[PDB]
């Protein structure tokens, strides 16, 4: 805001404020993997941590 | 919602309920009144109790 020089008896004026705003919509994000149950068995048999 | 009679084989159906949403904007109500200073004095001097 900007000040203003006034004298004895002179009117003391006013200023203003310039506000604003922003919005954001919530987005849903996923990711899926298709793993055969025959694979998860070999994942624990040969002890290779492919899924872990 | 209304349930449906289901046989041991028939498909259990789904009902349809519609949920809506209202919105109420806040409103300000104001009641003003002006009384004279002499009157305000008169209420206090005579134990009148008008103001209360």
């Amino acid at each position: 805001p900007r000040a203003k020089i006034v004298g004895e008896g002179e009117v003391k004026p006013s200023a203003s404020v310039d506000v604003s705003a922003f919005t954001a919509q919530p987005i849903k994000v996923v990711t899926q993997q298709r793993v055969s149950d025959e694979f998860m068995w070999a994942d624990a048999d040969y002890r290779l941590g492919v899924l872990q | 919602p209304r349930a449906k009679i289901v046989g041991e084989g028939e498909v259990k159906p789904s009902a349809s309920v519609d949920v809506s949403a209202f919105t109420a904007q806040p409103i300000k109500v104001v009641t003003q009144q002006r009384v004279s200073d002499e009157f305000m004095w008169a209420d206090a001097d005579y134990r009148l109790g008008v103001l209360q």
């Binding site: - | 349809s16 309920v17 519609d18 949920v19 809506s20 949403a21 919105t23």
Partner: protein, 50 residues
């Protein structure tokens, strides 16, 4: 078909109140130390030249 979250118009949340720029208050207060006086005019004499 089903109950969506679109019919139910959600309000939301407030991040807060941020000021765009850093405040550019002053510079005269940093260069020349404020020497306060009583109310009224001020006046000084300057003797120049040899």
């Amino acid at each position: 078909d089903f109950l969506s979250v679109g019919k139910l118009e959600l309000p939301g949340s407030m991040i807060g109140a941020v000021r765009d720029r850093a405040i550019d208050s002053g510079v005269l207060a940093k260069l020349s130390p404020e020497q306060p006086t009583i109310f009224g005019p001020v006046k000084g004499a300057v003797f120049s030249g040899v």
